[PDB]
Each structure stands twice: as structure tokens, then as C-alpha cells.
């Protein structure tokens, strides 16, 4: 229901690697770090963290630069695991965070090398799952360093505590719900068919359900759902379209479900 | 485990040095330490990963390398007398979780002139007859004197076997002339046996002093003998009377 | 804050007794704690590696506990034995292992239970190659201290716990020597334990 997540992306450049990190609370970014800046520094991307002060941001910036130096060695170690040359660019990705239950609900720390899964922290926060044998080298290293109890300490404690703090400092924006603004567009496709596109604009959070119905029966197998896109102002957009015959457009209804709606809306093409 | 070499070394000021330590245990972490009286253990350099090197507390004058995980050499480009110390190489399975396994230690002695290196002179002093009458025991005393540097190992050998029971050697040597920065040392040790054991003429007592000095490859321009690594012993036989 | 205190700095306990010493470190900025034992002429040896609060780790007669909330670790030694004489070092990695701080160390010295002491000073027979006469101060109580020498030519070593395993006998000893002609053994260790035998 509420989550905090960090995303690391380290990419080696044979032509120093570039480490890019971002942090999210639910669907709102609040921090960004880029190792290619003049003087790299953790930077705020939401108002409820700009008010934290220099000691907070100096500590964060230190951790980003420490992680970036570490991901550089990891990129060389991974390159050695797979016997890869130093003329090719490779990608190390990491996503971790915590989910708030009613009173931690679930914690996670998963990683990927060159797009495919590599290693992931199991849900009990005491073991790992390795994808290939190379990741088992990584798992044995982290097990020797007792890295599992380090993450359990973070996910069960620090992650939940600061997630609650962020949700309170920015409850005005984070714990609100923007109802989607909705309309239906009609476009002919043939001399016997037309496309009904159901729009949902400027809603927050991003989780939404757009379904088309024919005579009350869900037409989802025939619906084209587009990927939910960011509007750029903190809200999101999405549309769902279905192709209908030219003499049955008034048999199709659109149904939008969102947290910001008191009840799911039912829409219809209004010619 | 951690194979560190050499255990002892004497070099001239400025002659490049490389103290080697290796491990075939797949250990990610390796570090060099040095221990000095009054200062304790101080880290010189450490390596958390292959081709990763970070300075310790006292890295001045030292260089290291981690081209392959097995090896972590300590290089002294131009050694100076202040680097005369006891060095320890250590390794850990990973740089964070596991404990450190230490090597055997390198007692390095950097001198301005090898003319100050002297082998020890060993003498055994047979037990007092008053001690035999009073305590029914007999204490022998072995004296290793006039040696420099402090690279010696004293051991007692009774009837061809090394003995540790009834033995006690001084933990630190004495400077024969304490007002010098190059004074030769003197060491004492004691072997105490029963009066009956000392009174057996078939019992052979020998204290052995292993001197770690120069090598045969070193240059010697002095008229005296080259103070090479050598063993100097003194012996005493049992006395029925 | 990056400081590791080790208390006591030095301590003497009789063989067979039990002892403990403490390691202090800041509660915050903590990552791990190691205990190393460093016997003379040996190398530092790892005893315990503790990373969790309330950790209790036992190895034989040596046990240790870790209190990360108060920043303390206690090392316990039950039934002290002569082998326990060593410098025990406290190693506290800090700042998520980015700071490797060593303690000053607690130097443990095990004293023998010398009952029925027979303090005496003996003169040992000379060797044909030595110009110096050798004196031996032996069989004195464990709480007797051998102060240095007031004569330059006279050399005196410190006490030396000698253990005769087969007879279950231990004896403290100190040796003095000089090449001077006006050097006697009954006038070489000039606080003797009194009732010292002078043959």
C-alpha cells in the first residue's frame, strides 16, 4: 500500500563507469545521483526531502559515491565471471526497498546483469537466490560478509522508519489521491469499424484499471491497453481502446477504477 | 595458510625490498601491518579485491600490488632505518565478515652499514652445587652475548631432543651498551632439571642460538668473518660428582 | 567518533583464577568487533568475530559477549592457564567497514601459584670461554620484583617463570652477571623477599 524503492544503474564504458541512482516513495521520485556530474552529489527531486538539511544530504551523497566506487569493482568482477572482454559495455542493475503493512510487509533486494536476473534477496531476508553459477560466487561472498543480516537490519528497520517519515513530511502530496480526468474518443478505422479510446489523464497514484465492456461483458481480450505514461507534472496518463462495428458504438461502456475515485466510473461515447 | 617470507631480513639503506606473502585460500582481503614498541599494530596497505588498493594508517614509504588475488607484496622502493619493524601480512575470506589470518611475521632490520652485524657468542654455565644441595634441583644458564641485530632464536636440546619443560628464556634482550643506537645484545636462558638428572654423565645438554644474519649473496668487505645466518651452540655434560 | 578503549591496560592473575577485560567502542558508527590473541613470539590469532547485539560466543574456556547498544564487549577467561599469557587485541571495524580501528590491547600475564618459596642467590660455575661470573636469583615469591642494576657493568634480566612439567613444579628466576672482579653474587641484587638463602 506504501513503498520506498531505490534503483541503481551502473554501466561500464570502455571508451570509468557511470553510476545513476534514483529513489522513489510510491510513485514519487525524491532523490537522484549521477556520477558524471562536475561534483557528483545526491540531489532532491521532491519538496518533502529538500527540507532535510546539509547533514542529511552530505551523508546521502557519501553513500552514493561509496556505492558508485563499489559498482565499478563489481563490474570488473562480473566481467571476469563470464570471461568477457574489456571492449564491451555491460550493465549492473539493482532495485531494493520495503513495503509498509498495516502496522514491514515485504522487503526485497534484487539485482540483474546485462538485463537478465542475477541474484535476489529472498523474502525471509536471510538467504539469496542465484540465477547462474556466477551469481553463486556472489552469493558465497555475501554470505561470508554476513550481508543478509545487514539488509534485514535495513529493510525491517531503517527503510520502514524513513518511509513513514517521508509519508508524514509529504502527506499533503503523497497520501492524497488524484482522481483521473476521463473522456472517450471515437475514430473511424474502416467502412464498417471504429476505434473507441477511453482516456484517463492526470491521476495519482499510477495504479489504475481501464476495461471496455460489451453489453456488460468484459471485452478485455479485445482491448488494447497502452503502457501507463508519466505526464511530467507528477501525475500519470493511460488509455484503453477497442475496435467496434460502426453500428454498435453505444453497446460499449468504459469502466475506470482508481483510488481517487469514490466509485469506479462508467463512460460511454457521447457523439 | 598465509605464507609470508622472509621471516628475517637485513638490508642496507636504499636497496629496494619486496616482502612477499601469498595465500591459495581464495581470500579476497589482504593487508600489511607493522608493529613497533609504543605504537602497536598499524595498517600499511590493504586490498579488498583484485586490483584494488587502499592506504592504511602508515603507508608512507611502502607500495603494494594486487594484480592476482593470491599475492600481496609489500615493496620498499628506498628503505630507510625508520622502517625497521615487525611486519605482518594478513588475509580474510572477504573484506567485511570474516576474521583475519596472520602470517608468521617479518623482522626487517634496515641498517646504514652492515659492519654493525655481529653473530652471537654462546656460553653455558653449569649448575651451582649449592642449589643442588638445597633445592635438590639444578639450573643451567645459557648466555648469548654481543650480537646485532635482535635476530636470534635460543633453544635448549637435551640428549638430541628440543626441550621446553624446565626452560625459560628472556622475552627481550639487554643492550650491552644501552647508550647506543646500535648496541650489541645479550640474552639469557635457564634450563632447570632434577639434581639426579644433572648427575648422570650420559645426559647431554646443549643450548642453541640460531642467528639470522646476512646471506652468502651479501657483500662483506671487513677483515672479520661475514656474519651470515648461522647457529652458535654451547654444550655441557652430566657430572656425577 | 573513531576511538576504541581497552580496559584494563595490563593485568596480572594467578593461574587457575578467572578474569575478564573490556573493550569500549561508540555505539553508533559500529559495524563489527573482533577479538585477537597475540602470544609472545607467535602471531595474532583470531578468537571471536561478533556482529550482533547480545552475541555470546564460547570457545573452550574463553567466552565473549557483545553489547552494541552500550558499545561494550567483554572477554572472559575461566580457569586461567600459563598459555593464556598474551596481549588480547580488540578490533572494531567502523563506518560500515570503512574505518578499521584497533584497540591498545589488554596485556594478560598469568602468575604462578608459588607456594613454599625458597628464595636464594646462587653462583653458577663459569665456562672456559666466558670472562663473566653468572649469578642466579631463584625460587622467590611471585609478588617479588627484580629492580634493575645500579652498576653499569652489572647486567640483570627480569623474572622468568620456569615450568618443570613432569614434577608439577614452577619457579621464578632472574640471572645477573658481570666481568668485574669486585662483583659477588650475594651483592648483586642489592626488595629481596627476606629470608633469602645466600650459600
Amino acid at each position: 500500500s506504501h513503498s520506498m524503492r531505490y534503483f541503481y544503474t551502473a554501466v561500464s564504458r570502455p571508451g570509468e563507469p557511470r553510476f545513476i541512482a534514483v529513489g522513489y516513495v510510491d510513485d514519487t521520485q525524491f532523490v537522484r545521483f549521477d556520477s558524471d556530474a562536475a561534483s557528483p552529489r545526491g540531489e532532491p527531486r521532491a519538496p518533502w526531502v529538500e527540507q532535510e538539511g546539509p547533514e542529511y544530504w552530505d551523508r546521502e551523497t557519501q553513500k552514493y559515491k561509496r556505492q558508485a566506487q563499489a559498482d565499478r569493482v563489481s563490474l570488473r568482477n562480473l566481467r571476469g565471471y563470464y570471461n568477457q572482454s574489456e571492449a564491451g559495455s555491460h550493465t549492473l542493475q539493482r532495485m531494493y526497498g520495503c513495503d509498509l503493512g498495516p502496522d514491514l510487509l515485504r522487503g526485497y533486494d534484487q539485482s540483474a546483469y546485462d538485463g537478465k536476473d542475477y541474484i535476489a534477496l529472498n523474502e525471509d531476508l536471510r538467504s539469496w537466490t542465484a540465477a547462474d553459477t556466477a551469481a553463486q560466487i556472489t552469493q558465497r561472498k555475501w554470505e561470508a560478509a554476513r550481508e543478509a543480516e545487514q539488509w534485514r537490519a535495513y529493510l525491517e528497520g531503517t527503510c520502514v522508519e524513513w518511509l513513514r517519515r517521508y509519508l508524514e513530511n509529504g502527506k499533503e502530496t503523497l497520501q492524497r489521491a488524484e482522481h483521473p480526468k476521463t473522456h472517450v474518443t471515437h475514430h473511424p478505422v474502416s467502412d464498417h469499424e471504429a476505434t473507441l479510446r477511453c482516456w484517463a489523464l492526470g491521476f495519482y497514484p499510477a495504479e489504475i484499471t481501464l476495461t471496455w465492456q460489451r453489453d456488460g461483458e468484459d471485452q478485455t481480450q479485445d482491448t488494447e491497453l497502452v503502457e501507463t505514461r508519466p505526464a511530467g507534472d507528477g501525475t500519470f496518463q493511460k488509455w484503453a481502446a477497442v475496435v467496434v462495428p460502426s453500428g454498435e458504438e453505444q453497446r460499449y461502456t468504459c469502466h475506470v477504477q482508481h483510488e481517487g475515485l469514490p466509485e469506479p466510473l462508467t463512460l460511454r461515447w457521447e457523439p | 595458510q598465509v605464507t609470508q617470507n622472509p621471516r628475517y631480513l637485513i638490508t642496507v639503506t636504499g636497496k629496494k625490498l619486496t616482502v612477499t606473502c601469498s595465500q591459495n585460500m581464495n581470500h579476497e582481503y589482504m593487508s600489511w601491518y607493522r608493529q613497533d614498541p609504543g605504537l602497536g599494530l598499524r595498517q600499511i596497505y590493504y586490498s579488498m579485491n583484485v586490483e584494488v588498493t587502499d592506504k592504511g594508517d602508515v603507508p608512507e614509504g611502502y607500495k603494494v600490488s594486487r594484480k592476482e588475488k593470491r599475492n600481496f607484496p609489500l615493496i620498499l622502493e628506498s628503505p630507510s632505518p625508520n622502517q625497521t619493524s615487525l611486519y605482518f601480512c594478513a588475509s580474510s575470506l572477504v573484506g567485511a565478515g570474516q576474521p583475519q589470518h596472520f602470517g608468521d611475521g617479518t623482522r626487517l632490520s634496515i641498517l646504514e652499514d652492515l659492519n654493525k652485524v655481529f653473530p652471537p657468542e654462546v656460553a653455558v654455565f653449569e649448575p651451582s652445587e649449592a642449589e643442588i644441595s638445597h633445592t635438590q634441583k639444578a639450573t643451567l644458564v645459557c648466555l648469548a652475548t654481543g650480537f646485532f641485530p635482535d635476530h636470534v632464536e635460543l633453544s635448549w636440546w637435551v640428549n638430541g631432543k628440543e626441550v621446553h619443560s624446565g626452560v625459560c628464556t628472556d622475552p627481550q634482550p639487554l643492550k650491552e651498551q644501552p647508550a647506543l643506537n646500535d648496541s650489541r645484545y645479550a640474552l639469557s636462558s635457564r634450563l632447570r632439571v632434577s639434581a639426579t638428572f644433572w648427575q648422570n654423565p650420559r645426559n647431554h645438554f646443549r643450548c642453541q642460538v640460531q642467528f639470522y644474519g646476512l646471506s652468502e649473496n651479501d657483500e662483506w668487505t671487513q677483515d672479520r668473518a661475514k656474519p651470515v645466518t648461522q647457529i652458535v651452540s654451547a654444550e655441557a655434560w652430566g657430572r656425577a660428582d | 567518533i573513531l576511538n576504541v578503549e581497552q580496559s584494563p591496560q595490563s593485568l596480572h592473575v594467578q593461574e587457575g583464577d578467572s578474569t575478564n577485560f573490556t573493550c569500549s567502542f561508540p555505539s553508533s558508527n559500529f559495524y563489527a568487533l573482533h577479538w585477537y590473541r597475540w602470544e609472545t613470539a607467535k602471531s595474532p590469532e583470531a578468537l571471536f568475530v561478533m556482529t550482533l547485539n547480545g552475541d555470546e560466543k564460547k570457545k573452550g574456556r574463553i567466552s565473549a559477549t557483545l553489547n552494541t547498544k552500550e558499545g561494550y564487549s567483554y572477554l572472559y577467561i575461566k580457569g586461567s592457564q600459563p598459555e593464556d599469557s598474551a596481549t588480547y587485541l580488540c578490533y572494531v571495524p567502523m563506518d560500515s567497514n570503512y574505518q578499521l580501528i584497533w584497540g591498545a590491547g589488554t596485556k594478560l600475564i598469568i602468575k604462578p601459584d608459588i607456594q613454599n618459596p625458597d628464595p636464594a642467590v646462587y653462583q653458577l660455575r663459569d665456562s672456559k670461554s666466558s670472562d663473566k661470573s653468572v649469578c642466579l636469583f631463584t625460587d622467590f615469591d611471585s609478588q617479588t620484583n627484580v629492580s634493575q642494576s645500579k652498576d653499569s657493568d652489572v647486567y640483570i634480566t627480569d623474572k622468568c617463570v620456569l615450568d618443570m612439567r613432569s614434577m608439577d613444579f614452577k619457579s621464578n628466576s632472574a640471572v645477573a652477571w658481570s666481568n668485574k672482579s669486585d662483583f659477588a653474587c650475594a651483592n648483586a641484587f642489592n626488595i629481596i623477599p627476606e629470608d633469602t638463602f645466600f650459600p
Binding site: 551523508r59 553513500k63 527503510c159 | - | -
Partner: peptide
């Protein structure tokens, strides 16, 4: 806040 990186842990 960010998870504290440990000096020496890599992949």
C-alpha cells in the same frame, strides 16, 4: 535514506 554500502562487499 540510502542503504549503507559496506567497504569490501562487491559482486
Amino acid at each position: 535514506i540510502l542503504k549503507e554500502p559496506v567497504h569490501g562487499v562487491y559482486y
